[PDB]
Design an enzyme around this catalytic site. Structure first.
Site, PDB file in Angstrom:
ATOM      1  N   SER A   1      14.169   2.721 -18.191  1.00 46.27           N
ATOM      2  CA  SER A   1      14.960   1.799 -18.994  1.00 46.27           C
ATOM      3  C   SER A   1      15.933   2.616 -19.827  1.00 46.27           C
ATOM      4  O   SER A   1      15.512   3.421 -20.664  1.00 46.27           O
ATOM      5  CB  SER A   1      14.063   0.934 -19.883  1.00 46.27           C
ATOM      6  OG  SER A   1      14.798  -0.135 -20.446  1.00 46.27           O
ATOM      7  N   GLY A   2      17.227   2.431 -19.575  1.00 45.89           N
ATOM      8  CA  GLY A   2      18.242   3.089 -20.368  1.00 45.89           C
ATOM      9  C   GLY A   2      18.628   2.294 -21.620  1.00 45.89           C
ATOM     10  O   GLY A   2      18.333   1.102 -21.763  1.00 45.89           O
TER      11      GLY A   2
ATOM     12  N   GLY B   1      20.505  -0.374 -20.174  1.00 41.69           N
ATOM     13  CA  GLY B   1      19.826  -1.399 -19.398  1.00 41.69           C
ATOM     14  C   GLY B   1      18.796  -0.810 -18.450  1.00 41.69           C
ATOM     15  O   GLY B   1      18.381   0.337 -18.585  1.00 41.69           O
TER      16      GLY B   1
ATOM     17  N   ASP C   1      25.713  14.759 -28.960  1.00 34.90           N
ATOM     18  CA  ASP C   1      24.334  14.273 -29.006  1.00 34.90           C
ATOM     19  C   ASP C   1      23.569  14.710 -27.782  1.00 34.90           C
ATOM     20  O   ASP C   1      22.803  13.932 -27.203  1.00 34.90           O
ATOM     21  CB  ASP C   1      24.274  12.749 -29.154  1.00 34.90           C
ATOM     22  CG  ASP C   1      22.924  12.266 -29.711  1.00 34.90           C
ATOM     23  OD1 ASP C   1      22.282  13.010 -30.506  1.00 34.90           O
ATOM     24  OD2 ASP C   1      22.512  11.144 -29.347  1.00 34.90           O
TER      25      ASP C   1
HETATM   26  C1  Y56 Z   1      10.421  12.403 -23.106  1.00 38.84           C
HETATM   27  C2  Y56 Z   1      10.619  11.901 -21.682  1.00 38.84           C
HETATM   28  C3  Y56 Z   1       9.606  10.764 -21.266  1.00 38.84           C
HETATM   29  O1  Y56 Z   1       8.580  10.668 -21.894  1.00 38.84           O
HETATM   30  N1  Y56 Z   1       9.790   9.788 -20.169  1.00 38.84           N
HETATM   31  C4  Y56 Z   1      10.902   9.672 -19.241  1.00 38.84           C
HETATM   32  C5  Y56 Z   1      12.062  10.340 -19.493  1.00 38.84           C
HETATM   33  C6  Y56 Z   1      13.120  10.221 -18.605  1.00 38.84           C
HETATM   34  C7  Y56 Z   1      13.061   9.448 -17.433  1.00 38.84           C
HETATM   35  C8  Y56 Z   1      14.371   9.527 -16.624  1.00 38.84           C
HETATM   36  O2  Y56 Z   1      15.354   9.654 -17.240  1.00 38.84           O
HETATM   37  N2  Y56 Z   1      14.484   9.568 -15.158  1.00 38.84           N
HETATM   38  C9  Y56 Z   1      13.381   9.439 -14.006  1.00 38.84           C
HETATM   39  C10 Y56 Z   1      14.228   8.937 -12.728  1.00 38.84           C
HETATM   40  C11 Y56 Z   1      15.438   8.629 -13.186  1.00 38.84           C
HETATM   41  N3  Y56 Z   1      16.475   8.905 -12.195  1.00 38.84           N
HETATM   42  C12 Y56 Z   1      17.911   8.563 -12.455  1.00 38.84           C
HETATM   43  N4  Y56 Z   1      18.830   8.929 -11.552  1.00 38.84           N
HETATM   44  C13 Y56 Z   1      20.123   8.646 -11.765  1.00 38.84           C
HETATM   45  C14 Y56 Z   1      20.461   7.968 -12.940  1.00 38.84           C
HETATM   46  C15 Y56 Z   1      19.475   7.582 -13.859  1.00 38.84           C
HETATM   47  C16 Y56 Z   1      19.824   6.859 -15.178  1.00 38.84           C
HETATM   48  C17 Y56 Z   1      20.992   6.101 -15.481  1.00 38.84           C
HETATM   49  C18 Y56 Z   1      22.177   5.704 -14.573  1.00 38.84           C
HETATM   50  C19 Y56 Z   1      23.470   5.819 -15.015  1.00 38.84           C
HETATM   51  C20 Y56 Z   1      24.515   5.407 -14.188  1.00 38.84           C
HETATM   52  C21 Y56 Z   1      24.248   4.892 -12.930  1.00 38.84           C
HETATM   53  C22 Y56 Z   1      22.951   4.768 -12.496  1.00 38.84           C
HETATM   54  C23 Y56 Z   1      21.901   5.154 -13.339  1.00 38.84           C
HETATM   55  N5  Y56 Z   1      20.907   5.683 -16.761  1.00 38.84           N
HETATM   56  N6  Y56 Z   1      19.694   6.174 -17.295  1.00 38.84           N
HETATM   57  C24 Y56 Z   1      19.188   5.985 -18.604  1.00 38.84           C
HETATM   58  C25 Y56 Z   1      17.964   6.568 -18.949  1.00 38.84           C
HETATM   59  C26 Y56 Z   1      17.277   7.306 -18.014  1.00 38.84           C
HETATM   60  C27 Y56 Z   1      17.788   7.482 -16.732  1.00 38.84           C
HETATM   61  C28 Y56 Z   1      19.051   6.877 -16.381  1.00 38.84           C
HETATM   62  N7  Y56 Z   1      18.221   7.914 -13.572  1.00 38.84           N
HETATM   63  C29 Y56 Z   1      15.634   9.675 -14.494  1.00 38.84           C
HETATM   64  C30 Y56 Z   1      11.910   8.756 -17.151  1.00 38.84           C
HETATM   65  C31 Y56 Z   1      10.817   8.872 -18.066  1.00 38.84           C
HETATM   66  C32 Y56 Z   1      11.688  12.252 -23.979  1.00 38.84           C
HETATM   67  N8  Y56 Z   1      11.340  12.118 -25.409  1.00 38.84           N
HETATM   68  C33 Y56 Z   1      10.850  13.406 -25.886  1.00 38.84           C
HETATM   69  C34 Y56 Z   1      12.601  11.752 -26.142  1.00 38.84           C
END
Ligand code: Y56
Length: 355
Positions: free
Chosen positions: A26-27, A30, A143
């Site tokens: 979850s970003g 979204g 950031d």
């Molecule tokens: C501790 C960390 C924790 O406890 N848990 C945790 C941290 C990060 C994630 C994670 O970010 N992942 C796992 C698979 C996801 N793959 C991925 N690939 C491509 C893109 C994204 C993504 C996007 C995005 C943007 C544009 C197009 C498509 C997708 N936007 N987001 C937002 C948030 C995360 C990923 C993402 N993801 C990556 C999972 C579990 C931290 N604590 C100490 C602060």
């Protein structure tokens, strides 16, 4: 271009090329799903922004990141495979879907894997390459933290977002998880004003964490953050402190004066591989670069361009990645103007239609 609807916590209307949607996180913007793109034959991540134009902070972030994808084009920065909406007119417009290649993990997850020098120095190299590309496009991130950075199992890395707009009244934030000060440069904690090498401080803190396995400056509030910094690096020079605003300077000059810990004790040989001729060299190089990034006074902190040429990094240096200017410089003036909610809706919809 017909669509398929699939409920994944909320509900995802996506082009039919994207199959096997699976929630993976979850970003702040979204829900993210993994999916397979049968047209490209690859795994992708699909992110749904619901009514990004409803909230002003969400609108400026959605708009500026749509625009910024036309300004940057670099392997170490997010780039999109597709942008679409299932709604057919401006005024039924609600949802924007972003598609990119699927990444395996976030950096917050690799922190505890005790990487060797080859992998640590490659991650650092890539972070610096992406940041140099962002700076050339007019973007200071401000950031950077582990959660802004995603990696694949082959150790390739991408900075996931474009950071904090200067005009962000939200100070220094946006929340997938718990908001923290751990990576924020001292000039920012002190209210001083910032330059690009705020990003170098953040990269140093991230590199220190992946060396040590824990957070380097783990302050529990604004005041405790400063203390954790001066306890380890030493109270900064009188010149630096004198330049603070009087009330800040008064508090800061009245703290215990610390001498600082030599980096050979802060980052000793036993937390590094260090167990060979080759690793003793790498350890000495890694510590030297850390001592040039983790510098309180931004006027003496190493620049990105300088860090990129550091001997710790040379094994990876490739001008195709390190000397790679962006397609355009960002025109920020359009993100700083007022804009009603309906103006943001039109502005975002237009960008979506440019794809
Ligand atoms: C501790 C960390 C924790 O406890 N848990 C945790 C941290 C990060 C994630 C994670 O970010 N992942 C796992 C698979 C996801 N793959 C991925 N690939 C491509 C893109 C994204 C993504 C996007 C995005 C943007 C544009 C197009 C498509 C997708 N936007 N987001 C937002 C948030 C995360 C990923 C993402 N993801 C990556 C999972 C579990 C931290 N604590 C100490 C602060």
């Amino acid at each position: 271009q017909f669509y398929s609807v699939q409920v994944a916590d909320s509900t995802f209307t996506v082009l039919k090329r994207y199959q096997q949607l699976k929630p993976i996180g979850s970003g702040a913007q979204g829900i993210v799903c993994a999916a397979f793109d049968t047209v490209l034959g690859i795994n992708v991540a699909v992110k749904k922004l619901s009514r990004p134009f409803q909230n002003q902070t969400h609108a400026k972030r959605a708009y500026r990141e749509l625009v910024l994808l036309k300004c940057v084009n670099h392997k170490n920065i997010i780039s999109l495979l597709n942008v679409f909406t299932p709604q057919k007119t401006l005024e039924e417009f609600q949802d924007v879907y972003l598609v990119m290649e699927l990444m395996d993990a976030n950096l917050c997850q690799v922190i505890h894997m005790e990487l060797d020098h080859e992998r640590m120095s490659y991650l650092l190299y890539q972070m610096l390459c992406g940041i140099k590309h962002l700076h050339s496009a007019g973007i200071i991130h401000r950031d950077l933290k582990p959660s802004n950075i995603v990696v694949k199992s082959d150790c390739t890395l991408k900075i996931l977002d474009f950071g904090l707009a200067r005009t962000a009244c939200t100070n220094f934030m946006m929340t997938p998880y718990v908001v923290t000060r751990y990576y924020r440069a001292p000039e920012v904690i002190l209210g001083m004003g910032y330059k690009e090498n705020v990003d170098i401080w953040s990269v140093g803190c991230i590199m220190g964490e992946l060396v040590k396995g824990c957070v380097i400056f783990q302050g529990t509030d604004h005041i405790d953050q400063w203390n954790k910094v001066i306890e380890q690096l030493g109270t900064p020079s009188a010149e630096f402190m004198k330049k603070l605003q009087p009330t800040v300077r008064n508090y800061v000059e009245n703290r215990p004066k610390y001498p600082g810990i030599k980096f050979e004790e802060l980052f000793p040989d036993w937390i590094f591989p260090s167990e060979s001729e080759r690793d003793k060299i790498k350890t000495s190089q890694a510590r030297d670069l850390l001592s040039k990034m983790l510098v309180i006074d931004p006027d003496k902190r190493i620049s990105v361009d300088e860090a990129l040429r550091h001997p710790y990094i040379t094994v990876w240096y490739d001008p195709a990645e390190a000397e790679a200017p962006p397609p355009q410089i960002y025109d920020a003036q359009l993100e700083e103007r007022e804009h009603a909610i309906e103006e943001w809706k039109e502005l975002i919809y237009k960008e979506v239609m440019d794809w």
